Amino acid sequence: SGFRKMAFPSGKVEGCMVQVTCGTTTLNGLWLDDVVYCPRHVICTSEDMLNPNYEDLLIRKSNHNFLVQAGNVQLRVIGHSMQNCVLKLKVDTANPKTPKYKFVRIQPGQTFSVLACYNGSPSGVYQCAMRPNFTIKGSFLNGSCGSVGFNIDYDCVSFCYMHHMELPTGVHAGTDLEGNFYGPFVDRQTAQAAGTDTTITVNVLAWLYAAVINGDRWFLNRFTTTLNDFNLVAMKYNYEPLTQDHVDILGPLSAQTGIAVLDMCASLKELLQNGMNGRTILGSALLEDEFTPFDVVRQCSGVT
C-alpha cells in the first residue's frame, strides 16, 4: 500500500542524453539511432531570442558548428535539418544504448516522467501532467532545454515532450519530438499567454479511487449525482467537464472498489463545495490531478 507521485525508471532515457553546443549556447540533446534531437534555439544567442528568424540563423551554421558530446566522446555531425522547433543532427554513429522507442503526441491531462538534464547529464526525474492549457509545472533551470518527457510500456519508451522554455509566469512549455509546441507557444522571448488552466477531473477521480484502495475513505458519502449535476459543480470550480469517455476509463477502478463512478463524483462534489476541513487524502491537503486512471491501476498493480 501507499501512493506516491512515481516516475518511470529513467535508465533507458539516461543512455540517450547528449550535450549539444552551437557557438556559445549549450543545451541537451536526445540521441536515438543516428539522430540527435534538440531544441532549435541552440543556434541562438540570448540576443537572437527576442525575434529569431530560425531559417536565417540556421543558414549561417554548418554540421561542424554543432558539437555533440555523449558522455566524454564526441559525435561526428554529418547532417542537420530543422523540423518545426527541433533540430535533427544526423551523426555517423548509432547510439548503442538506443532503447525501443516511439514518438507520441500526448493529450492534455495525460502524465509523463521528465528527466531534467544539464550539459547532457541527468540531474533528476519527476512525474508531471500535461496541463489542460498545454503547459507543464516542471522544475527546470537555464540549460535544462532538450530535457525530455516520456512514458514506458515494458521495453518501449514513448517520448512525448522536449523542454524548450519557461513562461514569465513560471510554468513550462515545450514540444513533441517532431518539434510541434504543445499549446499556442512560440520559441521567442516574448510574453505569451497560457490559457486558463483547469483541474483534470478524471485524474482527481482516479486519485480518489487510489485513496479508497489505500484506506483513506473519510471522504466517501451517502450521496450520488448525475453527469449533468456534477458538471454544474465542475464548471463552478474550474474542473474539466466529465464525459462518458472519462466514466468508461474509470470502470476498472469503479469495479475494483465497488464504488460507482457517479457516487465517487458525489464525493468529489462535496469535497469541492466543503473543502477538506483540515484533513488529508493520501498525504495531500488538496485534490491531486496528476495521476491518470492508468497510473492508479499501474501503481496499485505493480506493473514493471
Ligand X SMILES: Cn1cc(CNC(=O)N(CCc2ccccc2)Cc2cccnc2)nn1
Interface ranges with a copy of itself (CB under 8 A): 1-11, 14-15, 115-119, 121-126, 128, 137-141, 143-144, 166, 170-172, 214-215, 275-276, 278, 280, 283-286, 298-304
**28 or 203, CB closer to ligand X?**
28
**What's the grid cell of residue 8?**
518511470
Q: Does the annotation mark 41 as catalytic?
A: yes
Could you write out the DSSP letters of every residue in 183-204?
Answer: SS--SSSS--------B-HHHH
Number of residues that bind ligand X (CB under 6 A): 18
* Strand 100-103, strand 156-166: pairing: parallel
- The one-letter amino acid at 292: T
Cα–Cα distance, 200 to 227 (Å, whole number): 15
Q: How many CB atoms neighbour CB 135 within 10 A?
A: 23
Q: How far is the CB of 113 from ligand X (least distance, A)?
A: 17
For residue 28, give the nearest of 127, 137, 151, 123 by alpha carbon. Answer: 123
Catalytic residue among 22, 41, 80, 160: 41
Instruction: Specify the stretch interacting with ligand X by CB under 6 A; choose among 25-33, 110-118, 260-268, 295-303.
Output: 25-33
Q: Which residues contact 11 (CB under 8 A, 6 or more apart)?
A: none
**93 or 189, CB closer to ligand X?**
189
**Per-residue DSSP letter, 70:** E
168 binds, among ligand X, a copy of itself, none (CB under 5 to 8 A by kind): none
189 binds, among a copy of itself, ligand X, none (CB under 5 to 8 A by kind): ligand X
CA of 139: how far to CAs of 70, 136, 144, 150, 196, in Å? 24, 9, 9, 16, 21
Q: How far is the CB of 166 from ligand X (least distance, A)?
A: 3
**251 or 283, CB closer to a copy of itself?**
283
Q: Is 41 in the site for ligand X (CB under 6 A)?
A: yes
Residue positions annotated with a catalytic role:
41, 145
